[model samples]
Target chain A: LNYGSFTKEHVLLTPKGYREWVFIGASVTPNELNDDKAAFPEFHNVYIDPTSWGHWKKTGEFRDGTVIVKELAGVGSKASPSGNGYFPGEFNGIEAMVKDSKRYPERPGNWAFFGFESYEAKQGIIQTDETCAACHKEHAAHDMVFTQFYPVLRAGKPS
Target chain B: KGLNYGSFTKEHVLLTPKGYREWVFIGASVTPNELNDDKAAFPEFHNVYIDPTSWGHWKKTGEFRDGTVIVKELAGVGSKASPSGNGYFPGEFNGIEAMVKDSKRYPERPGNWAFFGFESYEAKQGIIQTDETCAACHKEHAAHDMVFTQFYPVLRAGKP
Candidate 1:
């Protein structure tokens, strides 16, 4: 299933009584970062997958289920100065996610995912908050930022 | 003159054929299965200082700087002997060995190469073993392959 122009959702069933649900986002490349001079450029896309499953016993009620969103590599996103044709290793892209809803008030609701801005040559799966701050704090406007196209949580909002 | 960590750069210097030095680090992670079993993989990191000429003579270092690596499973059985589930992961391509030799140089010798080893498991927690401590286990467990054979992009490019 596709959600508007940004995401795709899929359901996987296994014989071991495991069911996995995932939501993947469509990749976007801004013109300012692309450096390869190719007609199109991109980077690793983001994904949300179920981390745990729930079982309902003979009881009439349902049990709790756990879900987690993870980030994965995407096409074209690898090139440095990735979106707009800048020098190699000069401009890196930004990707992040925040929870869409909350379960309680005055408490942290959902997880926020962030990726470190890295050169095309440096590719890996795991990234940390410190890595994000190390670069963004010096080069960009905000300490933690998604591109101007993405959305962020507003005051009193869940995400 | 003593080397400065910030300004240190790599320039090929020769070392003895037998008296080689290596900077080693060890770490582990909790696998997906372990997490399912209501366990958390609390990763542990440690390092080793080795004098390769005499493998028996080595010093262990602890509480080294923390870093992360990306691990990707291969198609067949991996470096470990667990089962088909055994595999390797692609880790951070940091210039570790080169940095060690560059920043901390030893007295003159000729033609020695530095080597590194990385290990992993599917348990809730892992211990950071020293060179001798880990070698004791690998000598008995692994298939006589001490050095892990994964490529680092920058190191392979010879830039870092």
Candidate 2:
């Protein structure tokens, strides 16, 4: 095997491609109250709202083991008036409507989140709106906060 | 009472019960007459390459098989002149041929005949030239001819 620095640019889009956000029990966020305090303990939550923060709450249980948490990004950044993010369901409905012209016009757009959670803990905080939009703009396109090429999400239904 | 014809050509003859005359003879020298420049009178001569299997078959039965006699050397004074000291001669004998020819006489005796020629000698010693030292050292090698060329006549004839 040979090694060399990779110097190239690649772009990813949504719906056709997908992305994810992952939060594991060991991943910590900085304590907002005090810089010196230990990082906020990890927790798990599934959310579609970008304006919220994922809160970490402890279960007060101890075990010698490892835990993994993951979050997936949805398609499109254009949010509905209700503030839901665009997701694969919207695109699927659009595709179906195009296939059959008898259907009513496609539904208005909204945003959805791929949520994250941790075990040995209670509930997760929704990510902050700034955190969501800012990260998406820098690292993604159409409101995706991460590269859409990874963590493929299936269309049509939740598994 | 028995009647006998005295030896006519110094060759001994054995008569079967049916009166067919079978001659038994031997010579110290056996070679092709082209090598000996002498020609002389003799009885019928048959030239043949000895087929060891024929001897084996004849040992089992009294009859000689057809086309089995490959070479015939005629009996004659010139034939004697080609003496290489290896020809079969009467009275000075080895028991193999007698056992082979006399089907009813020694049918149960186990024996084999092997004919080795010049090429066989070369291959055995792995030498291009015959080594007198090796020959002298292995004199008992002559006890059995030990050559298998007769068994593979076609191969021997086709080689360079």
Candidate 3:
């Protein structure tokens, strides 16, 4: 069930080689659209751990040890030859959520959130429920995961 | 790109793949005016995908097998600044393109790969590129097996 690494202090290590995982979706919340007060105003490129993706396909569940990485990128360019759209620019930052019954028994769905200061950071500190888990519990479509925004996860849901 | 059965019109024109968004997303590349020459050939965000079966094959064998289909969903450059910071935001979708590898189907082309383009995301039929337009550029710049593996770190996992 250990899909990602952890430190001796039981903190989640910043996942390496996550870009090779299964990309689920990308989303952006611009300040222009949200009164210049968007909480997360960057391009969020999401990827699911490979084994977790396989488990979901078979059981329709985000298995324990599931690690979902959300790579952040700044919004760049206002125009291209094609038209005006959100083109991703610099790599901003990264964060992840892991599901572990033992490590996060008190958390909702036994999922814990982790945010890194930089992509090169060795490890991440668990985020408070108010910072991440609350909104996910309130808005996420299923199992504290934002399946609504990711068509891949939506399609993977058993009919 | 999902596994396309290669449905064709009466003239054997390849139809745009349906439900490709559910396929294996490789990565995205943006070639904007600021980053490239004034006349960027493919100026936009290219969201690339590969068929699941083909992806699995590549992961196992490190080669693009025959019948591999790769799709590129094009999105235009949108807002440069957001509440968080100034950067590239996705605008409207512009067009779609695809590359299919089939030795029997395209023996005349190098690596037996052919490229196709659609006018819009909803376009049912795609027009194939001829005279070494895309294939030529790919053959010269593509990292391996006539594919842009350099731009996509996901494809690098195929290393066995």
Each prediction's whole-model lDDT (CA) = 0.22, 0.21, 0.74
Candidate 2: true interface contacts recovered: 0.00
lDDT (10s digit) by residue, model 1, range B1-160 = 2211221124432211111111111111112222234321211110112222112112122211111121211111012211112222212211112212222342231111122222332222222224453344333443213222111111112212
Q: Lowest-lDDT window of 10 residues in candidate 3 chain A?
A: A77-86
TM-score of each: 0.20, 0.15, 0.64
Could you give candidate 1's per-residue lDDT for residues A1-159 as a string of tens digits?
211111222121111101112222112232333443312232222222222111211222112222222222222222121011111111134334332233212212322333433434232232343543344334422222221111111111122
> Candidate 1 vs candidate 3: which has greater DockQ?
3
lDDT string for model 2 (B1-160, tens) is: 2222211111212211111011111111122233234431212122123343443343455334321222222322221201112221111111111111222332332222111121221132111113332223223332223222222222132224
lDDT, model 3, position A21? 76
CAPRI quality of model 2: incorrect
Which of 1 and 2 is the better model by lDDT? 1
**Candidate 2 structure quality by residue, lDDT tens digits, A1-159:** 111111122110111100111111011111221243422211111111111111111221111111112221112222222122111111111000001111212211122122223322222233333543344445542223221211111110123
Q: Model 1, retained fraction of real contacts?
A: 0.00
Candidates 1 and 3 compared: the better one by TM-score is 3
Interface RMSD of each: 20.1, 55.2, 6.6
Q: State how far residue A76 of model 2 sits from its true place (Å).
A: 34
| Highest TM-score against the true fold, candidate | 3
